[model samples]
Every structure is written in C-alpha cells, then in structure tokens.
Target: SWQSYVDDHLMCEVEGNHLTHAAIFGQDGSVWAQSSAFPQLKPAEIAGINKDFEEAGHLAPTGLFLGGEKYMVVQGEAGAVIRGKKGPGGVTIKKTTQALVFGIYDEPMTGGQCNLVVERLGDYLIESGL
Candidate 1:
C-alpha cells in the first residue's frame, strides 16, 4: 500500500530549515506543492481559551481542523475529538485519532507551478512532503 501510495504521491526527504517554501519544485522546472512547518503547540493551550465573543453560542470553531485527523492548527492533546465541517454543509463536532497536520499543493492553478510547461514541478513539490 505504501508503495502504491508513494507511486501516486511523489516525495523527497527534506532536511534543515534552510529549505524555503519555494525550493520544493520538480526537476521538470515546474512547481508542485508547498508546506510550512508548525511550531507545534500543546493541546491544553488551545483548549484553555474559550470561544471568542463572535463564536459564542455559534457553531463557529475557534481553531481550524486539518486533514482527516489532528488539530494541525490548534494546540491540544493528540487524537482529540473536535468539531469540524461536514462536506459542503459546514461544521460538525467529531473526535479524531490522529494529530493535526496540514499540507497544500498547486496544480492547474494560474500562477505558481501550474504555468511551468516544461515540467511538472508541482508534482515534485507534492512528493517532497513540503
């Protein structure tokens, strides 16, 4: 399964902070994905703050839910249950078993790597685990 997944999603081992968000490109001269490391906060810190006035009494979440599991943005316990959007509908509270992690990739987008016709740089970035 890992091989199959890796085949579809290419990646390169990135080392050191020297690597900027822009360096992750494909050999073909195109850009693919981009990522920024999180400071990695504690879960209690996130839960300590109550919903802001605007979010009070509303379903609006104080923090963002990322990926299938994990709070990615909000610092909190690992595998915590939290509220999140349900498809096109919006937010729904749920418990997740994984830590919060977030990632993004660019493709047919107008700017960035999409415009590079020489090579699929975007895919390279995606594989790099940017």
Candidate 2:
C-alpha cells in the first residue's frame, strides 16, 4: 500500500533492493531530504506519526522512522527513541535515513530511508554546516 501510494503520487519506483542502495547513494549522494523516502515504519506507525504531526500543527513537515543503532548526528528539535520487539523478519537489511528542510521559510525537502549493514562502510557524514 505504501509503495503503491509512492508510485502513484510521487512517481517513485521501488528500484532499490539490497543492491540498489549503492546506486542510490551514488546518484543522490549520502545526504537526502524527506521527500526522497518515508522512514521505515509499519503502516500503523506511519499513521500514528502523521496524526501527531497534524495535532501538533507540524506544517513544516517531518519524517519518522526507526534508525540504526549507530548515529552520526541529530540536530535541531531533539527526540528520543523507543525500542520495539524484533519484527517477524529478522535483520535482513541495513537502516539509514537523512532529513533536510529547505526553502527560505524552511520546509522539508526529502528524507532518505535505507539499510546500512556496514557502519560507515561507505563515505558518510553526520552533520552538515556545523
């Protein structure tokens, strides 16, 4: 369902499998914005985050997803992580995401979601303009 929505509205084809990760990074580079992808979450998780955003009047737009244990940077409006029971599917992929807000007034542009089985295996940075 999520992939369908993306394909219909965003014209995003799910090209990347485990192998597409490198090509994605090569074309888009390491840093990505929210529009790029939704952070990895189940359907319910996504819906809950959306409701929170709506109630909070988060018009600025934000992305939500579970991240890898390793983190390089997290700037601005800090948040906490709540761990969950491992899903039915074991760890079959890596996880990494990038969120950026753009425009003069600062709106989310694109967000990245991917699996990072290798920690910093490829060239990656945490914070920008720090």
Candidate 3:
C-alpha cells in the first residue's frame, strides 16, 4: 500500500529531470515508505541529515551554495532542491511535521516544479496526520 502510494503520489515527469525515486523518512531517520525496493539513505547519510539540521537549522543547506540555485528559503516546514553534476540530476527534500519526503532525479527540475511537489507532499502528510 505504501509502495503504491509513493508511486502514485511521487511520480513526476517534468521538462528537466525525471523523478526516479521518492521516499518518506521518519524524523528518527527510519524509512517509512519508498518508491523503489532499494534503500535510499544509508545510516551515515541519515545521520548526516540529522547533524546538518542540528548544526545549520536546515536540511542540506549546502544546496543553497550550489550553482543555478533556486528558492531563497526552504519551503514548507522544511525543504530544499539541490542541483548536481553529471547532467541535470538533483535532490529534493521536504520535511513535514512527522516525516521527510526525499526525491532524486536524473535532471535538474525547475524551482517552481520542485516547490509544487514539496508543498503537495507536505499537504498530503498533514492531511494524513502522519
């Protein structure tokens, strides 16, 4: 059921990057749901996110330092979209009251698109009371 939800909710094929994976991780860094059978974050990565938030008060704030940056501030409760090398790939993150929605793509999606996705997911989380 969770898998289906992820598939249905997280699927986005924008002009830039095509979203490859989507996942929801608990505040405690536990996986709640994911689109793929493979895991997304390792223990170290999860810990890194926790530490980043603790120290910087933001999730992956380094994303702001990257080139072609978008969004001056994080969206929703907390969110970020970071561009990457190797084509237009990037990572998008959105934190709800209960969990975090994480996504990856093979291309760089527009800031507006990312914002819409994050907000939609955040609203869903709130509605579900998760």
User: 1 or 2: which has the higher lDDT?
Assistant: 1
Question: What local lDDT score does residue 91 receive in model 1, on the 0 to 100 scale?
Answer: 18
Candidate 2 local lDDT, 1-130, one digit each (tens): 3232223323323243221112112112232322343233344433433343234323123333333322121222212111112222111111223321111100121122222222222113223211
TM-score of the candidate numbered 2?
0.19
State in Å the error of residue 90, model 1.
16
lDDT for each candidate structure:
0.26, 0.24, 0.55
Report how far off residue 117 is in candidate 1 (Å): 21
Q: What is the TM-score of each predicted model, taking all chains together?
A: 0.19, 0.19, 0.63
What is the C-alpha lDDT profile of model 1 across 11-110, one tens digit per residue? Answer: 2222211111122222222322333442233444333212221243221344453233233232222232222222222211211111111122222222
Q: Give the winner by TM-score.
A: 3
In candidate 3 the C-alpha lDDT for residue 18 amounts to 44
Off by over 4 Å in 3: 14-17, 37-39, 54-87
Ranked candidates (TM-score, high to low): 3, 2, 1
For every model in order, what is the number of clashing pairs?
18, 10, 2
Residue 50, model 3, lDDT: 52
Judged by lDDT, which candidate is best?
Answer: 3
User: Which 10 successive residues of model 3 have the least lDDT summed?
Assistant: 64-73
